[PDB]
Amino acid sequence: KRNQRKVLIGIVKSTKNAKTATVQVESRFKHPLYHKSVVRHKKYQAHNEGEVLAKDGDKVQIVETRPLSATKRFRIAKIIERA
Amino acid sequence: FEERIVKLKRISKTTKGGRNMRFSVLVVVGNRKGKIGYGIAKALEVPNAIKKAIKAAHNSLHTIEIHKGSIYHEVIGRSGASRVLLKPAPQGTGIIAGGAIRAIIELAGYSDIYTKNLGRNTPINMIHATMDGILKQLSPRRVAILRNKNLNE
Amino acid sequence: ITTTKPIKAHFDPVADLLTKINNARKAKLMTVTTIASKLKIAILEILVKEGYLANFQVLENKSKTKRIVTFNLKYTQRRIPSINGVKQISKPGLRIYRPFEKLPLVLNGLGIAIISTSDGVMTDKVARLKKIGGEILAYVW
Amino acid sequence: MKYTGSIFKRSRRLGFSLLENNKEFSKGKKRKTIPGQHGNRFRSSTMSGYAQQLQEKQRMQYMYGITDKQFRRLFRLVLKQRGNLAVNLFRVLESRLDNIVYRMGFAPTRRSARQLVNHGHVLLNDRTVDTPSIILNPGDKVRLKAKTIKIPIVKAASESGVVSPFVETNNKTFEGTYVRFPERSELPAGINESYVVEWYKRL
Amino acid sequence: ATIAQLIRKPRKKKKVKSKSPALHYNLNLLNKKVTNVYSPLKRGVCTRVGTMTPKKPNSALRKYAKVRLTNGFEVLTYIPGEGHNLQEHSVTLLRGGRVKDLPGVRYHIVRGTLDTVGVEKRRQQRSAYGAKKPKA
Amino acid sequence: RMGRVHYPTYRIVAVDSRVKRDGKYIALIGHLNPALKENKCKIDEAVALEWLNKGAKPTDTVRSLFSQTGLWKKFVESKK
RNA sequence: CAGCUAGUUGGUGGGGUAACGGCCUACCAAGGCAAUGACGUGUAGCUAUGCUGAGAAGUAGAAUAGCCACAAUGGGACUG
RNA sequence: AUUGGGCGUAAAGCAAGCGCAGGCGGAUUGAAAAGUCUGGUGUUAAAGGCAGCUGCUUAACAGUUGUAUGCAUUGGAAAC
RNA sequence: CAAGGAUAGCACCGGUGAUUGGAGUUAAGUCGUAACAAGGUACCCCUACGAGAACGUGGGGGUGGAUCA
RNA sequence: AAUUCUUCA
Q: Which residue positions does the secretion signal occupy (chain E)?
């Protein structure tokens, strides 16, 4: 690909289904009502190519690619090892 | 001295038989050049009450200087649960305040200043809030003396 | 030298410093003691170096872990405080941040405002010279 | 309105004359009170900022013959740019065609000049105009369509009319120019600038 | 007020009701529903004409009308001015406002341009509560 | 074009022909307020040539404006 | 308004589209969304903006113009 | 009520307690850059809001010139 | 594939609905006088019973109570 | 045991 480097660091939760992993991403910003710093979590289901593996408990990176299925728009490139 | 008067009340104490109608007056006095004061009095007739108020206002004067014609910082008059906010104004735009406070700050000798009342609209406590707000301020020469600096830089 | 009295932090040295200095000014006291951090020594230095305080000593013990600090208040004879009030802006319950262009002046800019920049805690206008922003910790007048 | 039609009715109540003193000087009985059934002392009943502010507004906008929305437009115009509001306002209120023609000595009354300008008997920089609305900037010449030479009102005005300091003109050639801005002390000082300006908080 | 609660519990505005609920609704014939366009005034037909005494501080003998509008709502209204020209189901046009002598009445009557004509002999303030100016 | 009645002011703009008049456009070229034909049209003189070289066809009235200012001569010889 | 969800989430062969794709299909699967508010209901074309306000913003989405949807209502397809 | 309020007697402290989740949170040290600071690049249609200028007998207006604000991307430092 | 058509049964939201429950507001309307003082039986709160009502009484609690103390 | 005192300022 050529698109911008999507920085979507987050704790991948489960690869309960084959060649598919669900990762939650945490985003911090300023709430536009009281200027309080607030975070939200959002889920994303991504495809694992197979040459690189993502496991449970990791904090991995996600990039954009062509749509493979319904609500699966992304693929994984880098996997931070376990702890 | 200009000796302008502000809102007057109609009060009466109660005894056996009718009521003792004896209203009170409040007044502000100033030379429009730096010396100002205020007073409150009561009497049976208008001229006597006015004269007593003028006396009690004029004996109890206090001094305040003029910085370029306005105040250079913000003050919050806080007395008797009646706030009033004062914010600095440019070299000149025209006086903006409430009527009673308009008289108070015009008779002091200021050109223009940002004024807005908060809370109650009772003139006497409003004047007192203006007083303690304008008095408890401090000068750049004051901080120059107390801080280890000759001139404020 | 042998403070002899047990002390402890409040919840955060930032609020504790202002509360203790305000209480000392109100009660016309000389010094107080408070838990010391590198942020504490930095803030004390950058506030005293502008004539708003006096000598402050950081006090540690035989070990390298227990540190406190006590500061002398700025005063003039007849006991008129040089400090005319403090109000902390950044709170543990509410973070506040301000860019360079919107750093407010101290009631005309005549006073001193302490801004925690990305590289050094240091006052308002001399930070406006370097345009480096940060968070505002306290208004002192 | 463009013209009320009565001039004494307000100089009576407002207490000051339209001109120096010649209008309300004497015509059988000199009076300086309010007209109607109320010849009586009224000076200690409604004295306050609003009352005299309105009185000064009314005095000013009958001195200059302008209505209230016209002057609101003028105040909006002068509020746009920098400058002391009182000075600019007092300078622009004098910058009307009729009042300049009055000050030049070409008319014995401002209202006659206002009628004549709308009647198209005056040239604005070698061009005609029937709208007394433009503000006169320095460096502009005026002539009165010299066909007007036979008009009795204009020769009567030019006979011994009061020549204003801030304006220059020749009456034997009916040709004039507006050279300099007005000073505070060179104009009728009966208007309190601070009081009239402070009346306006709506804009 | 602790801000950690305000994020979890946003503040709410009061936004008190209007001075006139009846003058807002309109009614069509399309299996009618209820809609509001904040109508300044509405046409109606009277059904009741009578009189009623005011509350405690004063005393008089006013006149009221029970008018059904283009909507299903029926509402009381006040008749202003001298005289009376309501004759038991004549079309009328309402106007907003409020009265204090008659509780439960908040509507005046535009008097002058309908089957009801505003009385003469009224020349001061004759535009409001209409009355044709006599020629002189 | 947009302006006052009895006094039009047509801005010359290169835009696709499938959008309505005076609608959304891409780049601004110039303006014409009709009170003279000697010096009343002014263009950036660079973006117009860029548009004409990247594929465009001038509007019917725009040819005169291009001819008045003397731009056609460098145009055609640029093409061939 | 505490459950919603059954081509719903995922895999492989194939078809189809301007293309990715449950868009469809054969089989295998058992998932997916939800208190950081889905689902249900109520009202609403969105935006630049207009008014007010010092501002954070309250409010109307006039006219105008950008985008979306509709053409008696509900459907279907050809032409290009 | 973020800039901008209170809960002794004026409306308001749940009867009290145990506490999951959430939020807040002592000191040293390195790293990280998620926020936070910040150079550059791209973009935020036009008109209109605003500031100058030109013309319609002049304001109304029309035109022209410039004008903030948010967002992405990229490079730098690490007080909290 | 299928717009629609017919059938039957669930879910949601209204309009009206004999008769009735109470509610608010009204020039001087009828019964008693509960409370404000020790309101003449201290009041108030919770609860249960009872009376045409004002409310009375029983149990628990407070002074937001009076004087003698 | 021990009660009521018509609206209007």
A: none
